[PDB]
């Protein structure tokens, strides 16, 4: 392909027109044409085309670049120290992979709550408030909250709030086997989101353009979006505020924070031009201002310009939300993490899977280890005729396979109780029995029934371990719950 020109890919939500203005200035000084393109799914197309026809420079959040660098698609970035000193050190950290810089950092992006001041002068502090607020607003033909549900970037902050995480970080490194998408925190967060949908406070099909149009036309009081979205809100004249995201179970929503970054194609015959453009035209006060005026960048990596932008209270809120969430890893496994979470939310939200099934598959799809055990609890009921008769009785659980007593439990009076959970790692039939110990109390004849208890461990359609408990009186072939009846002999 023809290559005398500098080709740049950037997402269609960002200020590509401003960036083209910077490219026109560079064309004047150098005679080199700059073409800015914004194809759909550029982050996916880049590794396919990177065969010629790839861009010379690609702009995306830093999370994608480890994967690009692992596959040899990116040139190493080696700016002078004089240039490095112009950007915040934590932005360089985001583009450092195996000790090498693999992009230039541009801007820090975090999601915020965006709210309509005319509809909602006091935005909710908690997610838990949102359903009641949606009832109130529905009575006036409006909704409380619409935001993009199709992309896990937008739902993650809530899923993370109470404990969800992608990869545990420990001792300078990410453990790619320690994935946090299937824990109690993730489950609680996704369950909340799904219930909002089930209770008709949000629709499963809401995507980027639907939520943007609803907010910018005054149809919904709130949305969740990044700084790039402020420009179309300005034009719409909605009277809006940008604030901290709502809390969930008292924890902050924790957005994954992206650093918009610019990488150089390892196959580009124009590396030096690309480096000249980025360092001497774009990452200057004038360069970033031209992009930012088209669509806001967020908190920019260039210290000299960020000092001006930090006065903007929308940027203070951005940084407030950024501190509460965290900077995404840049490791190759992030792609798999994201497709995993995307599948989970769409499936749970649409009712294809339960929240537990969705996140269990997400855990594996993200590269977490297959949980290959199953547990069950054997339950006992004791029945005394008199209410308030709290006479205690005890029960034993014996393994026939191992010929020993596993556990004993006590019930005072009428009641149900369970033995502690049994764990199985392999399919088969497991044999136990349960019986009541003789009573110390001479006023009662204990039930002498013995129960045979069989646990069948089988695979379900998906290869997951399943355990079913079947219990019978030792006399019989008929199934029966484990229930003992103690007769009182005294008044
Ligand atoms: O839906 C699956 C999707 O997952 C991965 O995309 C993630 C991006 O890598 C990640 O940076 C983030 O993207 C957001 C940008 O950072 C932000 O600048 C703005 O453009 O919105 C983006 C969210 O739409 O989050 C997404 C996950 O939602 C993966 O890399 C993609 O190829 C894949 O299609």
Author numbering: 8 to 57, 59 to 499
Published text:
The host protein is FctB, the basal subunit in S. pyogenes pili. Here we describe the first successful introduction of an isopeptide bond into a non-isopeptide containing protein.
We turned, therefore, to a fusion protein in which FctB-iso was joined via a flexible 4-residue linker (Ala-Gly-Gly-Ala) to the C-terminus of maltose binding protein (MBP). The asymmetric unit contains two molecules, A and B. For Molecule A, both the MBP and FctB-iso moieties could be modelled, but Molecule B lacked interpretable electron density for FctB-iso. The crystal structure contained well-defined electron density that extended over the side chains of Lys-13 and Asn-117, clear confirmation of the presence of the covalent linkage between these residues. The introduction of the isopeptide bond does not appear to cause any perturbation of the overall polypeptide conformation, as superposition of the FctB-iso structure on to that of the parent FctB gives an rmsd of 0.73 Å over 118 Cα atoms. As in Spy0128, the isopeptide has a cis-configuration, with its C=O and NH groups hydrogen bonded to the side chain carboxyl group of the adjacent (engineered) Glu-67 residue. The isopeptide plane is stacked against the aromatic ring of Phe-24, ~3.4 Å away, in almost identical fashion to the isopeptide in Spy0128-N, which stacks with Phe-52. One difference in FctB-iso is that its catalytic Glu residue, Glu-67, has two discrete conformations, with its carboxyl group rotated ~90° in one conformation relative to the other. In our engineered FctB-iso structure, no bond formation occurred until the Val26Phe mutation was made, filling a cavity into which the Lys side chain might otherwise fold and directing it towards the Asn carboxyamide group.
